[PDB]
Amino acid sequence: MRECISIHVGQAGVQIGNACWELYCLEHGIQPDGQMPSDKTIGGGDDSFNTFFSETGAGKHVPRAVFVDLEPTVIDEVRTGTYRQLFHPEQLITGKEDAANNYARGHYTIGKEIIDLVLDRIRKLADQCTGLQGFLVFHSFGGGTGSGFTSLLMERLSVDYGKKSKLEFSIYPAPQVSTAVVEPYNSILTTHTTLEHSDCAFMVDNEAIYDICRRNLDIERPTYTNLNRLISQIVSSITASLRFDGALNVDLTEFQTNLVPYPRIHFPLATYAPVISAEKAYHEQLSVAEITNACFEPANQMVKCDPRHGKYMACCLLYRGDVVPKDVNAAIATIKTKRSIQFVDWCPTGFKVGINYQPPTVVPGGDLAKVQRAVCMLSNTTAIAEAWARLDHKFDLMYAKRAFVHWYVGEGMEEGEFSEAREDMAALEKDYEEVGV
Amino acid sequence: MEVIELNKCTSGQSFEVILKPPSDPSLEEIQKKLEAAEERRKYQEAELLKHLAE
Amino acid sequence: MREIVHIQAGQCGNQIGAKFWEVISDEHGIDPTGSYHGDSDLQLERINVYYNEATGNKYVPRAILVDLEPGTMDSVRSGPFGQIFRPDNFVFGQSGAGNNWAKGHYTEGAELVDSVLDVVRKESESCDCLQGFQLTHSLGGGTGSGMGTLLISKIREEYPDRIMNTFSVMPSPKVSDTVVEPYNATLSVHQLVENTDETYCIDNEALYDICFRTLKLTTPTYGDLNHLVSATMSGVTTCLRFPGQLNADLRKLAVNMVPFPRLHFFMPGFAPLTSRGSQQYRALTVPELTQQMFDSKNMMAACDPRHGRYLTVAAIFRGRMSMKEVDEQMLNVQNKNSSYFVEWIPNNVKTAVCDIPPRGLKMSATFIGNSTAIQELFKRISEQFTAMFRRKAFLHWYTGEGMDEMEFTEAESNMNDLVSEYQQYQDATA
Amino acid sequence: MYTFVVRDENSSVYAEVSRLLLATGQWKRLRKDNPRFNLMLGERNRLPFGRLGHEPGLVQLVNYYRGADKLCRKASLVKLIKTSPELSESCTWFPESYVIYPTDEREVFLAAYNRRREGNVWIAKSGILISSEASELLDFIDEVHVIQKYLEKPLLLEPGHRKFDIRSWVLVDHLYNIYLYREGVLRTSSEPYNSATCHLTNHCIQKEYSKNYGRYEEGNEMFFEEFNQYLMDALNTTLENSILLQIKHIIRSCLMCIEPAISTKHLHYQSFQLFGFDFMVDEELKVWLIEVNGAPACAQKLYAELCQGIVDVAISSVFPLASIFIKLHH
Numbered sequence A: 001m002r003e004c005i006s007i008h009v010g011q012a013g014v015q016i017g018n019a020c021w022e023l024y025c026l027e028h029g030i031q032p033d034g035q036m037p038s039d040k041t042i043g044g045g046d047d048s049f050n051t052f053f054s055e056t057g058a059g060k061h062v063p064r065a066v067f068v069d070l071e072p073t074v075i076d077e078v079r080t081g082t083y084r085q086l087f088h089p090e091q092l093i094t095g096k097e098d099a100a101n102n103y104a105r106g107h108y109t110i111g112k113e114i115i116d117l118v119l120d121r122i123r124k125l126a127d128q129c130t131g132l133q134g135f136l137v138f139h140s141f142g143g144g145t146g147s148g149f150t151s152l153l154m155e156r157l158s159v160d161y162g163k164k165s166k167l168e169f170s171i172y173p174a175p176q177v178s179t180a181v182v183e184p185y186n187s188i189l190t191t192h193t194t195l196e197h198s199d200c201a202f203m204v205d206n207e208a209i210y211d212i213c214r215r216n217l218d219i220e221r222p223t224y225t226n227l228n229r230l231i232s233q234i235v236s237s238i239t240a241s242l243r244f245d246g247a248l249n250v251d252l253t254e255f256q257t258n259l260v261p262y263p264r265i266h267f268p269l270a271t272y273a274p275v276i277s278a279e280k281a282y283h284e285q286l287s288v289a290e291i292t293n294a295c296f297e298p299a300n301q302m303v304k305c306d307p308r309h310g311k312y313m314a315c316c317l318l319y320r321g322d323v324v325p326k327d328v329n330a331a332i333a334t335i336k337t338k339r340s341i342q343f344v345d346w347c348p349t350g351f352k353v354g355i356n357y358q359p360p361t362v363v364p365g366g367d368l369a370k371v372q373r374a375v376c377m378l379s380n381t382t383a384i385a386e387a388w389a390r391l392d393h394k395f396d397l398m399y400a401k402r403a404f405v406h407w408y409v410g411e412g413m414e415e416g417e418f419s420e421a422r423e424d425m426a427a428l429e430k431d432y433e434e435v436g437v
Numbered sequence B: 001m002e003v004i005e006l007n008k009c010t011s012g013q014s015f016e017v018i019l020k021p022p023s024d025p026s027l028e029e030i031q032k033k034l035e036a037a038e039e040r041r042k043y044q045e046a047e048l049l050k051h052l053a054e
Numbered sequence C: 001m002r003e004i005v006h007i008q009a010g011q012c013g014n015q016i017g018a019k020f021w022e023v024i025s026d027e028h029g030i031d032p033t034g035s036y037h038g039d040s041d042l043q044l045e046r047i048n049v050y051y052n053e054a055t056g057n058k059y060v061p062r063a064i065l066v067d068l069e070p071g072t073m074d075s076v077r078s079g080p081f082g083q084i085f086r087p088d089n090f091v092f093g094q095s096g097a098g099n100n101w102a103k104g105h106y107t108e109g110a111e112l113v114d115s116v117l118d119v120v121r122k123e124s125e126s127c128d129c130l131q132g133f134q135l136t137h138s139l140g141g142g143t144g145s146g147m148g149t150l151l152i153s154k155i156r157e158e159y160p161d162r163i164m165n166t167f168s169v170m171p172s173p174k175v176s177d178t179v180v181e182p183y184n185a186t187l188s189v190h191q192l193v194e195n196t197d198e199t200y201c202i203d204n205e206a207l208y209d210i211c212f213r214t215l216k217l218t219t220p221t222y223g224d225l226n227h228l229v230s231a232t233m234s235g236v237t238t239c240l241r242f243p244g245q246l247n248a249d250l251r252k253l254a255v256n257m258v259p260f261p262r263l264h265f266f267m268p269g270f271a272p273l274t275s276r277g278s279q280q281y282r283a284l285t286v287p288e289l290t291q292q293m294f295d296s297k298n299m300m301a302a303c304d305p306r307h308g309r310y311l312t313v314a315a316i317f318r319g320r321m322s323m324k325e326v327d328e329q330m331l332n333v334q335n336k337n338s339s340y341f342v343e344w345i346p347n348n349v350k351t352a353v354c355d356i357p358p359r360g361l362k363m364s365a366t367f368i369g370n371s372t373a374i375q376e377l378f379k380r381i382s383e384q385f386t387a388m389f390r391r392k393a394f395l396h397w398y399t400g401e402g403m404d405e406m407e408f409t410e411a412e413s414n415m416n417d418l419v420s421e422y423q424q425y426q427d428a429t430a
Numbered sequence D: 001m002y003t004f005v006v007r008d009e010n011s012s013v014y015a016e017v018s019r020l021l022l023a024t025g026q027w028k029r030l031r032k033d034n035p036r037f038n039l040m041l042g043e044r045n046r047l048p049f050g051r052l053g054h055e056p057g058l059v060q061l062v063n064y065y066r067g068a069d070k071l072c073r074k075a076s077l078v079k080l081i082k083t084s085p086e087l088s089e090s091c092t093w094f095p096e097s098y099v100i101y102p103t104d105e106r107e108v109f110l111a112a113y114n115r116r117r118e119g120n121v122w123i124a125k126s127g128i129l130i131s132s133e134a135s136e137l138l139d140f141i142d143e144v145h146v147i148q149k150y151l152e153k154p155l156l157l158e159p160g161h162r163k164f165d166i167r168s169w170v171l172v173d174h175l176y177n178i179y180l181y182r183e184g185v186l187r188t189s190s191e192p193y194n195s196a197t198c199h200l201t202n203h204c205i206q207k208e209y210s211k212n213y214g215r216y217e218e219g220n221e222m223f224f225e226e227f228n229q230y231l232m233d234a235l236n237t238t239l240e241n242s243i244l245l246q247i248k249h250i251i252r253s254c255l256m257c258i259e260p261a262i263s264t265k266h267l268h269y270q271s272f273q274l275f276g277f278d279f280m281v282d283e284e285l286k287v288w289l290i291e292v293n294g295a296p297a298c299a300q301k302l303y304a305e306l307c308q309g310i311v312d313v314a315i316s317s318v319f320p321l322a323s324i325f326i327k328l329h330h
């Protein structure tokens, strides 16, 4: 058993973290108490769920998780929330004033004053790991903390934990819920600095899940609560292999191996189905074929793009519920004939499948309905570069006029870092285009 | 349509299907960057307090 | 617990400052004695932003009252919410400033400014995490204009990393007290461009025209003018006083609204426009709020937004309404008039919604626009300035206090530079 | 009010559509780089499809289909027909073609070419070179082309003993309805077809190198009413039966083959596009496909009717205001 430590940075990271760990507890039958009756091994364990939980002599199961935010309101809700007993105080780190949606303020100014503290609190979790394999980092692209402090943290983890893998769950900015005009600046800046330090990053466009909530959950104006509940399901699907008995993606290293041939191109597109409203009185349960086919509909992707006009480097199917290999291959065969699915010449046209018989757990009173089977597809397609192009375009528009730049320079950043980070993104778009065209 | 490496357990199972075959910065450097930016802030603030002094 | 220190300077400053505290104290359920008697927890969740707590759970405004004569401040102390203010925070002289910027900035006010900075310091030390300062004042007088900008410069020296915000009332011959107002205003703007992060431009020309044309008030008083100001001030500080995602503090607002450091002069707007005691009975529909908040007739600065372009916009809707309909209507404005929003700042319009409405209304909307059309305001003041300065008229009032004609020339030039900088981005394309 | 942008100034077809749209008084043209548009009349190359459909509160439509280039490029069309089972190697309406690279199917072309010698005329298309000498064609390429079988026995129009090709305009809307324009045109050669300027029916090559340009018909262009009449008089048949049935079959086959790859039915943005299909016909009244144009111009006297049709069928269908087309049913 090799442990995994989750790092939640900024408002988005924390509040999503809250959603994920709430879900984890329900899936592993852990109470807000922190108690797990099913765990007969008291005070310790070599089990698969111990990857995400440590145990106390009293039998409390504690998330191997650290929460950080440069402003205390959000993490203060965790300290007083339902799962307050779940974490111990040293896991929840808070500052006094935030990064004000400014990358440079989160990275240089305020980051410098707390980075050593966080690393020490992380070190204290790592010291309780027999074989720490790596980190899962949750954060927004748009925020000052999420972008600025994360890139600083990712740089230092590569120093203190060079051998260890690092995976990202990144929230890509969408105007429909964005709180700042400069989020394109912060996004490019944190991507540039973090790129070499992240082995595999899952981008979630707030635009996509916002519409999924409108379209499929019949929610008129989705809140972060609506968004996070859905996101957590996706994250759970992705991390289920680390927390349960299986043979696919059983360690963080296998994510890079399976989904990331080229290091820079480490942004797999996630697609999930089915998403059903709990308010739908009558619902016809969807088959293996119907949900598998939905993994190739853009309307279900975590990032809206068109894989038909790109190439695949790898694909992974992660099923939860009543699913057997025979029905999967039958669905794959049919889908291959009907859809446009072209891999790169130097990759096998195939799918790494993983099934877990336990159906998706849903939060009681949530927006999501219980289903007998669901799937999460992880596909490394060049089509996701459409998201980089959109972002880089917005960046070019503002930076051409040096709009808002003075806010960053005033925090100690040099104007050169802007163009430096933009150049890296220009090369990245170029890499994607070579591989896929 | 070749299935391979089928692994089964009580929790579930996993496998792979193939349709077709193929055809860094040191801690030191970081501390410098954070300190270099700090000095630029301190310089800018010094020029302000100099301007205000005038 | 991010605190804001409020300062009000001069007659105008203290008049609107008093009305401001009356309005929001009522919104936060605080009575004239400082005791809370509200029926919602939302009222106290961010009360610490503007209020200090005392024993007996008394809420005391973090407000400093400044003037060079005791006239208005005695009226405040004898006003309805007079008792609420911390008595020691009443800082006043006796000589007055005689509508003279030089008296407030260099002589009379220089004598009193240290006393004010002592009170500011005592307030700031008590802060868990000071955001910065908001100042209310006019630019046409002497105290609020001259001494007010003196205070700002000194506060920036002691608190250079804190945000400086102002509600600056602009002079107008339609409501003019003196002929030297264009001088005082030009000299003040010179200070504001350098030493503030956010300035709400409250044009007395606009407030008068709104009172006359729209509210059909034939003989507008300052009370009619300040009903509009207090309503606007309450609106623009909503995101600061209640829980929210957007522009929740002064810095995040600045980062969203100010693409360039000198261009931080905002054009406020409010809807629905009401007069005191009007007490209208039909709530506005979300579409009605949206069309009116963007209407030129609802702008508190006498500038035509169609004569310029919007760099950034902040809209705040108050009351129980459909957040879906708000988003739709806000998207509808931008998409129907996309030409008036600069294309080189994507998604430059941000919207917030607060469940708690202002007293006397079920529905309301506040507008904050950083438009290049604000140059019309500074042009106007510049024309009035040059008309006198070309003959050095009335300068003896200023040279008698030690000022040189050069200082006027420099002030004029910097304002004319501000105007040209706005015109630069009004023509800029992507 | 609806909004649209123009990013292809050199488009005669959509310059007219743009004019027509404005004339309704319900469409306002924006600056090209204003992203808050309902409609995009995009550029020909490197169109940013990836930035479409990400504008809240705006239904966005574009006048091009992403992936349609697989049909509108020479080498891609060949590869599409050979490798797609819906069309298959056994495709009887597309000439024998091969893709050749200068300095690939060179080996395969020669393998069949040697078969021919023991009519063996071909054509190399990227400047064109018609020749029976394979060695000469290969040399011309070197100093990416397609080698195609030349139609030695074309249908010749009398009087004149001259060849021609047919241009059909096809409009595909956002629902992938296939609309064939009522009117087509025959780009005629004004020169007597010589077995051993008169081989290329190009309007530019005709105007420049032909002495006889415009004697038989206006600008070497015969329209369907006249061509239909001639077919009844000379050959005792109709345009509908002898030719159009095959044309409608070819158009459907090509676009239905590519539909799964380019359809915008469930996409976050929508597409329509005007295509130009070019056909030859032989002595036996058998229709052949030459190529497909993704950005076709129109015949001068047809611009008005066609462009109005685009607005009615492709644009107003998505954005309603306050038939000249034959629907090729699937």
Ligand SMILES: Nc1nc2c(ncn2[C@@H]2O[C@H](COP(=O)(O)OP(=O)(O)OP(=O)(O)O)[C@@H](O)[C@H]2O)c(=O)[nH]1
Pocket: A009, A010, A011, A012, A013, A015, A016, A069, A070, A071, A098, A099, A100, A101, A102, A106, A140, A141, A142, A143, A144, A145, A146, A147, A171, A172, A173, A174, A177, A178, A179, A183, A206, A224, A225, A227, A228, A231
């Ligand atoms: N999906 C999702 N996105 C969120 C959530 N909270 C914030 N965001 C997004 O994150 C971006 C803003 O970054 P934040 O995480 O809020 O800011 P931060 O990391 O705390 O950084 P600072 O507050 O500037 O110090 C915006 O694009 C938001 O839409 C959340 O709970 N769920």
Ligand SMILES: Nc1ncnc2c1ncn2[C@@H]1O[C@H](COP(=O)(O)OP(=O)(O)CP(=O)(O)O)[C@@H](O)[C@H]1O
Pocket: D095, D123, D125, D148, D149, D150, D151, D152, D164, D165, D199, D200, D201, D202, D278, D280, D290, D291, D293
């Ligand atoms: N396989 C073939 N057999 C017989 N004639 C042919 C032929 N291929 C082309 N031609 C003749 O040569 C002309 C070349 O036109 P092609 O369409 O090949 O290039 P283009 O793309 O430059 C012209 P347009 O775009 O206007 O149709 C055709 O119109 C036709 O008259």
Ligand SMILES: Nc1nc2c(ncn2[C@@H]2O[C@H](COP(=O)(O)OP(=O)(O)O)[C@@H](O)[C@H]2O)c(=O)[nH]1
Pocket: C009, C010, C011, C012, C013, C015, C016, C097, C098, C099, C138, C139, C140, C141, C142, C143, C144, C145, C169, C170, C171, C172, C175, C176, C177, C181, C204, C222, C225, C226, C229
């Ligand atoms: N809106 C408003 N404006 C005022 C008020 N009193 C004065 N003014 C304006 O402020 C200018 C005079 O400045 P004043 O505040 O009296 O000078 P000071 O007290 O010495 O700073 C003139 O342009 C007036 O129009 C007021 O109560 N309300």
Ligand SMILES: [Ca+2]
Pocket: A039, A040, A041, A042, A043, A044, A045, A046, A047, A055
């Ligand atoms: Ca155990």
Ligand SMILES: [Mg+2]
Pocket: A010, A011, A071, A098, A143, A145
């Ligand atoms: Mg935050």
Ligand SMILES: [Mg+2]
Pocket: C011, C012, C141, C177
């Ligand atoms: Mg006065």
Ligand SMILES: [Mg+2]
Pocket: D291, D292, D293
């Ligand atoms: Mg062509």
